Amino acid sequence: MTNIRKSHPLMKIVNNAFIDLPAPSNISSWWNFGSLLGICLILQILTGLFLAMHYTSDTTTAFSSVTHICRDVNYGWIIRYMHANGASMFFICLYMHVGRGLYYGSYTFLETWNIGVILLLTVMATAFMGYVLPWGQMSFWGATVITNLLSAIPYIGTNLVEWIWGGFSVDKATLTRFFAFHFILPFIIMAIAMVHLLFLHETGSNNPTGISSDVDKIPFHPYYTIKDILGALLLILALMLLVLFAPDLLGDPDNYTPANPLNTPPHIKPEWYFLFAYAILRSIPNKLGGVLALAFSILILALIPLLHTSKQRSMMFRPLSQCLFWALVADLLTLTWIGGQPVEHPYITIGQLASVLYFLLILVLMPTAGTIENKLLKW
Amino acid sequence: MTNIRKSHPLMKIVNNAFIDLPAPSNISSWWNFGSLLGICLILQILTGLFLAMHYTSDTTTAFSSVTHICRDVNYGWIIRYMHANGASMFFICLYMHVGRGLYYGSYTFLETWNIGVILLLTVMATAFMGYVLPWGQMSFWGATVITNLLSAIPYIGTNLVEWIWGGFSVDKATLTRFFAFHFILPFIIMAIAMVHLLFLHETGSNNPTGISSDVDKIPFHPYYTIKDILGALLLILALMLLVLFAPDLLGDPDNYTPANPLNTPPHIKPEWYFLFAYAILRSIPNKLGGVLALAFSILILALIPLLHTSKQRSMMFRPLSQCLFWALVADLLTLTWIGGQPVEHPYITIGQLASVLYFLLILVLMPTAGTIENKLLKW
Amino acid sequence: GRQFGHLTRVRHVITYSLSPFEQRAFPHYFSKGIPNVLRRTRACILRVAPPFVAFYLVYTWGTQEFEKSKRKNPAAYENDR
Amino acid sequence: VAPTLTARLYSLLFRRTSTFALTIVVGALFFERAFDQGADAIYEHINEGKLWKHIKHKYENK
Amino acid sequence: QGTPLAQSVEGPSENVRKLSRADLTEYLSRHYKAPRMVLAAAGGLEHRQLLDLAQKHFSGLSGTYDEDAVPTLSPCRFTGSQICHREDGLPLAHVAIAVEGPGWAHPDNVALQVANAIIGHYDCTYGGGAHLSSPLASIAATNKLCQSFQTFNICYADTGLLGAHFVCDHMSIDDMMFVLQGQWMRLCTSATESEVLRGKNLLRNALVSHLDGTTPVCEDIGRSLLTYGRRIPLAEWESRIAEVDARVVREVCSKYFYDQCPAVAGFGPIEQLPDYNRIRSGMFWLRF
Amino acid sequence: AAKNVVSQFVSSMSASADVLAMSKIEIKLSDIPEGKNMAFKWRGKDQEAAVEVSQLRDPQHDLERVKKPEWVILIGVCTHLGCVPIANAGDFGGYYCPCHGS
Numbered sequence A, B: 001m002t003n004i005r006k007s008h009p010l011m012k013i014v015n016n017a018f019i020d021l022p023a024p025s026n027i028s029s030w031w032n033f034g035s036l037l038g039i040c041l042i043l044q045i046l047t048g049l050f051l052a053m054h055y056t057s058d059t060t061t062a063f064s065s066v067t068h069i070c071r072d073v074n075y076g077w078i079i080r081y082m083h084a085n086g087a088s089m090f091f092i093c094l095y096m097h098v099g100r101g102l103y104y105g106s107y108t109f110l111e112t113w114n115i116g117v118i119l120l121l122t123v124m125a126t127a128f129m130g131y132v133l134p135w136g137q138m139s140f141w142g143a144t145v146i147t148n149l150l151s152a153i154p155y156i157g158t159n160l161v162e163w164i165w166g167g168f169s170v171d172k173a174t175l176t177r178f179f180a181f182h183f184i185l186p187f188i189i190m191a192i193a194m195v196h197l198l199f200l201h202e203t204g205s206n207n208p209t210g211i212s213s214d215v216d217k218i219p220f221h222p223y224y225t226i227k228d229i230l231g232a233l234l235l236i237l238a239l240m241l242l243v244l245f246a247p248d249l250l251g252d253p254d255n256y257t258p259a260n261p262l263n264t265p266p267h268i269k270p271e272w273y274f275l276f277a278y279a280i281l282r283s284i285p286n287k288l289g290g291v292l293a294l295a296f297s298i299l300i301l302a303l304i305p306l307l308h309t310s311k312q313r314s315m316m317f318r319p320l321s322q323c324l325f326w327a328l329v330a331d332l333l334t335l336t337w338i339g340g341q342p343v344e345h346p347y348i349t350i351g352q353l354a355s356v357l358y359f360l361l362i363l364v365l366m367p368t369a370g371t372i373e374n375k376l377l378k379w
Numbered sequence C: 001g002r003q004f005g006h007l008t009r010v011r012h013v014i015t016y017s018l019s020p021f022e023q024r025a026f027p028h029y030f031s032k033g034i035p036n037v038l039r040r041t042r043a044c045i046l047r048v049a050p051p052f053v054a055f056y057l058v059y060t061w062g063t064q065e066f067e068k069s070k071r072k073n074p075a076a077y078e079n080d081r
Numbered sequence D: 001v002a003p004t005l006t007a008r009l010y011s012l013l014f015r016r017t018s019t020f021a022l023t024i025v026v027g028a029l030f031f032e033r034a035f036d037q038g039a040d041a042i043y044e045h046i047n048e049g050k051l052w053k054h055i056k057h058k059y060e061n062k
Numbered sequence E: 001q002g003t004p005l006a007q008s009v010e011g012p013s014e015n016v017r018k019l020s021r022a023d024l025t026e027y028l029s030r031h032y033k034a035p036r037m038v039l040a041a042a043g044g045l046e047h048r049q050l051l052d053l054a055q056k057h058f059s060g061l062s063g064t065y066d067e068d069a070v071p072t073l074s075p076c077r078f079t080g081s082q083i084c085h086r087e088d089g090l091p092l093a094h095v096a097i098a099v100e101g102p103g104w105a106h107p108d109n110v111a112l113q114v115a116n117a118i119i120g121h122y123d124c125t126y127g128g129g130a131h132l133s134s135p136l137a138s139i140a141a142t143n144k145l146c147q148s149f150q151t152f153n154i155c156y157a158d159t160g161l162l163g164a165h166f167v168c169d170h171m172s173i174d175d176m177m178f179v180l181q182g183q184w185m186r187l188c189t190s191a192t193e194s195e196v197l198r199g200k201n202l203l204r205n206a207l208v209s210h211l212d213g214t215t216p217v218c219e220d221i222g223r224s225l226l227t228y229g230r231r232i233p234l235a236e237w238e239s240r241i242a243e244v245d246a247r248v249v250r251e252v253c254s255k256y257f258y259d260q261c262p263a264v265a266g267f268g269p270i271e272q273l274p275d276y277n278r279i280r281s282g283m284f285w286l287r288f
Numbered sequence F: 001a002a003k004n005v006v007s008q009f010v011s012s013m014s015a016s017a018d019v020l021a022m023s024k025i026e027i028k029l030s031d032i033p034e035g036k037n038m039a040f041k042w043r044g045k046d047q048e049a050a051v052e053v054s055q056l057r058d059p060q061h062d063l064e065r066v067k068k069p070e071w072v073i074l075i076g077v078c079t080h081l082g083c084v085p086i087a088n089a090g091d092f093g094g095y096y097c098p099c100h101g102s
Ligand code: HEM
Pocket: A041, A044, A045, A046, A048, A049, A050, A051, A052, A055, A066, A080, A083, A084, A087, A090, A126, A127, A128, A130, A131, A132, A133, A134, A182, A183, A186
């Protein structure tokens, strides 16, 4: 390393965690969602910032101010639309970034998975709170439902809720909080991210066949750096095309009306990416037991590594283990549309049915599927 | 390293940058200000946070809201007083943390010094903006003076100012900005800090005699960890004793009156730690040339390493090089009280005198002092 | 590389020490100490005090010279003419 | 000879690090209950007739 | 430090020069009288045929009994301390760590005989490999964390020393110290009935095989009389062993090990050997 | 000191003296017979009146004919009514019973 400029400030040797990080040869495009999360994250914080400079947190002000942006501020309309739609284009990435996780059995990495779980669990909190900030009608009641739901806890419930509200209801001081949180909190996600990426550098990436790739490696600079850029580009359209021609399409909530606590909207739902979770809840008639499922919905992702039941990592070689997996996809997709429907006996029964199936696939079938095929191949 | 728990998560080997970091044996208490900056920094962000939850940024609201904290919020009065006085106890540390820098000649570390310079230069910006937020009288005019001063630039000046203001004057949108900045910006300081500490781990600390300490080193865990805690404790009193018995002492600005653009206060000054800089300015009659000095005031700290003129690092062994240095202390101390005085002719002349002396010590005398003593000792 | 192994080479340097229990938290703190403070207070004080002294004079002198000028208007020009 | 109060104490408590931890908790437990009560009287004894606690007796329940 | 026991056998060099046969004759005169002296023997001899030719000088040349006061002897202090002779030339760095223990005649002398069998010992050249039972002979053989080490046990009149002696390369010295204190501390709490046996057996083995040959027997008889009195409790040894039980060990070693002040002495390139206040903080688990 | 410190930061977020100035004492008022209407909101709007603060629903529960005394109202109210009522949700079918109308 003679006059290699990579040593001289030390910090650049830390920057050879990228450039020479060896990688597998064969990598499907499905591994591009590594980057496209990050860039969807950065593009927030900036566009997340220049909204803050004109926003104001007050029960009296807030809604007026958001009016004030789209009308009077030069280029003020693009930003608000990049930010909001920049949320949805964030999840649609995020889920895929889990999907690759299972179907190739990347969860075998035991630590990096977990930090994965938390890192999800935080976002769902952030992308919630902000959704209150506009203080519109669907924000007000959609605030009461989610929080007041938490009263289910047997004893400390009644106090613990009133604590967060800072009062009896969702009036001012409940707003001001949810600004100061939704502001800071992404930075922490950025903090964890540079941890969540760390452990990965020890074992390198997995690769589609589920085989130790040792004999075949490639420099990271000339090759995958382009492919991410190419990946980075297709996002923009998918972001622009949506945000530019059809603003309100995925902006499915129709309600800009200033919140009136007296009135109630006939139908009330979160925005789309939440629905299925909220759909789980309606199933259980028993209130307390109902909440647990919703909490237990995601956490099961942490228990999956205990269920690795077979002798080969991938699902690309297991037809059965592949067969079921897709049914789980439609099963979720079902839940989405279910919750987006009124609670009327043709729907009611259905959600109750799809609920059990969901767990039954993950928690029983899939761990069994691997057992048979071991027996088949004579393993 | 058999079953040493320090490997197993990798992140803990990164945490042996503390515990076994070898250190010199003899270390004066003057090296405790390494930590006491950090803790004064953390203690901000928290106490800096729980103010945000009840603060509101509006021309109409803001001042009312700060009223609302000291009156109506349970334990609301301590926090505001910890935060503000937690600023002054931050600088009084910070300067010492530079003072140790010169007098032992630690600046010989060439990179870590520079990152030191920036890391200062940022704080002075933050601890400014926040001081606008209360929107009191001394905040309003103290805002106009500092910013409008920047118009001195020959051509782009007139626009560049109006840009930051977002208008012709300091009305609303000038406030909302300075909240969203003063909120985020400390995190960046925390970002740099973990860089500014990095390079240090390569060369280890210096030690009072200015000698390579190699033969004598000590584990960092059993010994200095206590001493910092002991150091960490004496702060609290010095913070508490001030914030508890005598709130407004160092709170020298007397002005809570809601800002009226029409009226003007008879005397106008920044809070104390700024004054000397602001005192430099009054000296120069010529406006443009005046501003440069103020900018050139600090930056000279970066040029000091070029001036290392002698064959031995410390100033503990150079009586002359020590003799002058103390005069520089009073010289600053002079400037402080000078700016804190009206601009009548007994004062006027003085500041002009102390101004030249200041540079003359740093920029001429001290680099000469080392030359003679080399010649004396027969070097 | 690793910090402690390779630091430097030292030869034939012997060290002795006691448990912290065997010995005391204050081996004649006041008696042996109070002289030690003095002999090391004076070595610096020659080099430290004088500059501050200069300041305080200026400060006092400055105020007086300031005072006479403003406070007494009928000083240089008295009220006759 | 019998062991000095410490010599007992060390063997009974500070040996097992559990107890050595536990004793600390109960210690601060009783501590704050007695300690805080004393601090008031000392302060309160300083100001007499300057607090409703005394003053309120003139007008309280008429 | 500070007792007649704290000194070299051969004494500092300067005395060797100045020493005159005056002192010798004095030293001769003082310490060679009986009861101090003891005769022994083993072999084709029986007893009688010895005792007649025990008899006449020395009946004897005396070998006297008067006083020489009594008996110049006095308990000694235990100073928890450290010493380092730091020399960076030599290839390898010795270490010895020790904690003070009871004297010759005492019940606890047996329990501790067994412990230092259990921790066992390893050396460069054994045919053990990585499959050995001794938890320090498995680990330190794996990576050769230390070239060799043995545990020693020495018991004086009123006093005894417990500790090990290990050689290892300088980059490696830390990792011994930790993995060592693992052993002593897992004994004083987590020990187990089964593992006791493999310790218990070996002692029966070595004790007996130590008695092969004329001289090793006789040599024993000599010190025993001066030590335990006449007792040569051969079969009794076994009877004393079956005393040893799980609760026996963990009550014994809880005394001398857990939370004490060790005595460290080392010989360069010691440099990485941790500073003292680590070791003292490594004797007592916090339950980690 | 830790315990006090910790409660302090947390006791701030707990509640505020201002919202604590709510919890109606008033109530008091008014309507007549039917109305309803009869709501306000005010996160509460003792009672008091007397006593009362029990419940029937939100927005001038306000009592069950104030136990036949006053209420607002005093059940029936205008379409549909006060307690039974129904006046459940949009607007049917279970009214304000319960049974005793309490
Ligand atoms: C992962 C990062 C972020 C996510 C997922 C996120 C998500 C959201 C969402 C869903 C909204 C509501 C959208 C809408 O009301 O149209 C929102 C609004 C807002 N966000 Fe963020 N945001 C993020 C980062 C930030 C950052 C870093 C800031 C400040 C620097 C920020 C400031 C705001 C503000 C002020 C609003 C209210 C403006 C508005 O909603 O119209 N956000 N954010």
